[PDB]
Amino acid sequence: WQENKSWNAHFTEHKSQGVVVLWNENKQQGFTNNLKRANQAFLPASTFKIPNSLIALDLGVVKDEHQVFKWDGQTRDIATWNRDHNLITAMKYSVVPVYQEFARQIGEARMSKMLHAFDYGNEDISGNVDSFWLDGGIRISATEQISFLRKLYHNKLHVSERSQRIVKQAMLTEANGDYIIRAKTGYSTRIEPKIGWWVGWVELDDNVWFFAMNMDMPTSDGLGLRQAITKEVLKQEKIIP
């Protein structure tokens, strides 16, 4: 591993504080601006939609990425949630109520087994099964996010290959002729310190770069900065143009 504090320029420039952690899959080498923070475990928040998706698919609570999850009819803050969703849009728009229902159907017992199987964070689901990833006992650090994602990428998790492909599909965030980003955003607000997450990978023609970042996010104004700071780091490291 290497610590590169020059990345703090990209944080400070965006009026921000946080960590980005990079994993170069070909060379098996890691880079971060803050070794301590890289290992600090926080609530996964909506980054939990990755393991949650895999388990629901594998257990058949979600048939496929086309099954419609109708709106519960309760108007919420984020207009984008106030509508019917499939897996692709629910991840795209980070649709909490949809996933709480998945957790409710999966159940405490099947959820615990699955997370032990995944070696995911502290594998703690204390709280209710329907929101422990927002305000329960589950904690995961940046480096643990990377370890889990490398297993996903390589179809190595103990759920079906199909479930893995489907979630990787739902993870698609950005692509062009230079790179493909598969990733998931998160925003933990219910327990201090409030933090945003962006975790996933960048696929290049002959290599894959895994990332997991988080940053202090005391207000929902700064959410766009998760991607912006990450991109500035990826540019600096010559991974993207």
Place this chain on the structure above:
Amino acid sequence: WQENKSWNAHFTEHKSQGVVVLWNENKQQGFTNNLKRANQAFLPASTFKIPNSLIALDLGVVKDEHQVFKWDGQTRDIATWNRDHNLITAMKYSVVPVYQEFARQIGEARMSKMLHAFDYGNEDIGNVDSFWLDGGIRISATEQISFLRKLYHNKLHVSERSQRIVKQAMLTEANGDYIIRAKTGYSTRIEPKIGWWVGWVELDDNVWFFAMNMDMPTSDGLGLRQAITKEVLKQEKIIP
């Protein structure tokens, strides 16, 4: 089917001639600037990498999207071909010599049987590693849409896995506004030299299938495949 000749302005711009065909999935309605050309058949050229990929995957000729097909050491015209490839990059760079080997490994019996199962155009394969480039196989833009629609819905006669991996390999462009999975072609071995772009645009709420071809008298206009298609897509408010 609706004809919309106002789309010709996007071809006119560049002294280009050709067709864009669109299919609105929610609506089960299609649109095109030229109904006649929409139904004319041409060599698929590299758009055939889609069904070739499905066939190679289903038969185990290709293990997965990570398997490396080492370069054969013979330098070829197109610089991106002169290196090692997997299914992702062999598709992205339309790496003919990779796909010719797939087709030689598939064989004429199983290719011909697969193409009939697929209802793929005229299905016209002793032409095994080249029929899609200079053989008798022909497909129209409208037939491209029908084939793509089955692939989209995993309706084809290959595994779900194989369909999913090819759709992954088709990924071309993605935004917060849209996802394009597609495949280019460029047919120069038989007249008329033409360019193709076929695939679909994934939105939150809908999917829009497309298939375009155009006269390509020189390679200087290859950018126009995607460029003219996007102009039509923006006119139809499909993408901002």
